[PDB]
Amino acid sequence: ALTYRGVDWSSVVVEERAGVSYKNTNGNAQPLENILAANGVNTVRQRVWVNPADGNYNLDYNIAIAKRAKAAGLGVYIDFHYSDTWADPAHQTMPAGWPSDIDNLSWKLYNYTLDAANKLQNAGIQPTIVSIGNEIRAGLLWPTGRTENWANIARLLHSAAWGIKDSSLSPKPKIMIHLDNGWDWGTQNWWYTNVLKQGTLELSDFDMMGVSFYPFYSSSATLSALKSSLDNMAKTWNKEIAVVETNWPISCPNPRYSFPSDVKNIPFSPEGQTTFITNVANIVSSVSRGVGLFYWEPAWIHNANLGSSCADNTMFSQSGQALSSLSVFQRI
Ligand SMILES: *[C@@H]1O[C@H](CO)[C@@H](O)[C@H](O)[C@H]1NC(C)=O
């Protein structure tokens, strides 16, 4: 059903350097990319930071693992955070050295994106998907692209999109805009409506709408709300749709928020993960042009809670062995 069955495996090299030895379900040591491929994954998502001090997630880091993904027969989804560090609705920190004025910033953004795209092409990497920003629900490149600076946001995204379109990438990747809280139709609608009404960024400038969907940051994140929101997004703008980030815990003894009503019966276990993932996948497939699902960081065992209040959201044992839930990608 789904065109893209993936996971974000960005931390792979960070973990291997930390001594992690990944193993398949039989317990046989094997490269992570091959384990993922063997379990049905056909696309890997990777976060790209501009100039991180320690180099993790910078372009070189990403080209190195992208080559490995390619060798395993996996497509690559590049997620530009357009920051030197984590970008989310509460943080869209300007890359060091980048100008603040809209005119020069727009040009910098175009240059950076164009340059990165060409370097990827030159390394033989043609991502199938490229998101111009990560969870830019509150904008990007703050404060210049901070909501409600809609004019600036539209202008910046237009520049980023064309940095891709003017690149040597062949074939070209699908261009994606990624917002958090996919279940929140009101916000999705508020954002796209205000950005698109500016006129600079046109509907034709991008191809996909991605959303994050997590069950442990608000009980409002019901599967019902996700279905309704995605359906509304699909019929309003008719773009391809995907849940680009999601997690389900194998352990959550200390949640900060109550879980959504329609997922309360799913247990915190590998079996529970397969049920949740399969359900979210099928929700996406039931949507017009719903084409993808990406699990976030299933193998980051040294950050098991994956930034959430739940103790463990990974799909690998603490020794690095893939859990039974990883095969879910063979059934969606
Ligand atoms: C963008 O790159 C061009 C070279 O093609 C350069 O002349 C220009 O100064 C750059 N813009 C910014 C703001 O870095």
- Per domain, the residue ranges of the chain are 1-332
What is the rounded distance in angstroms from the CA atom of residue 48 to the CA atom of residue 10?
9
Ligand 1 within 6 A of 239 CB? Answer: no
Ligand 1 centroid, distance to 104 Cα (angstroms) = 8
Do 72 and 30 meet the contact criterion of CB atoms below 8 Å apart?
A: no
Closest CA to 91 of 58, 150, 140: 140
Closest CA to 99 of 88, 115, 110, 89: 110
Concerning whether 245 is annotated as a catalytic residue, the answer is yes
Ligand 1 within 6 A of 104 CB? Answer: yes
Closest CA to 77 of 212, 203, 210: 210
Ligand 1 centroid, distance to 105 Cα (angstroms) = 10
Residue 25 neighbours by CB distance under 10 Å = 15
Ligand 1 within 6 A of 108 CB? Answer: yes
Paired with 29 in beta bridges are: 23
Q: Please give the CATH topology (third level) of the domain spanning 1-332.
A: TIM Barrel (3.20.20)
Residue position matching structure tokens 């680009």: 244
Structure tokens at 126: 């043609």
239-242-244-247 Cα dihedral, nearest 10 degrees: 150
Phi, psi torsion values for 64, nearest 5 degrees: -60, -50
What is the rounded distance in angstroms from the CA atom of residue 216 to the CA atom of residue 307?
11
Residue position matching structure tokens 């973990």: 15
At residue 126's C-alpha, the angle toward residues 123 and 130, to 5°, is: 120
The continuous run of DSSP H or E covering 293 comes out as strand 290-296
Ligand 1 within 6 A of 163 CB? Answer: no
- 28-63 core/surface letters (b: 16 or more CB in 10 A; e: else): eebebbbbbbbbebbbbbbbbbbebeeeebbbebbb
Ligand 1 centroid, distance to 125 Cα (angstroms) = 24
What is the rounded distance in angstroms from the CA atom of residue 274 to the CA atom of residue 331?
10
Instruction: Supply the DSSP symbol for 190.
Output: H
3-state class of 7 per DSSP?
strand
Ligand 1 within 6 A of 118 CB? Answer: no
Concerning whether 297 is annotated as a catalytic residue, the answer is no
Ligand 1: atom nearest CA of 99 is 13
Instruction: Supply the DSSP symbol for 115.
Output: H
Closest CA to 150 of 189, 200, 108, 105: 200
Do 8 and 296 meet the contact criterion of CB atoms below 8 Å apart?
A: yes
The CA-atom distances, in angstroms, between 145 and each of 100, 101, 141 are: 9, 10, 5
Of the CA atoms within 13 Å of residue 76, those in its CB half-sphere come to 30
Closest CA to 299 of 81, 86, 18, 77: 18
Reported resolution, Å: 1.9
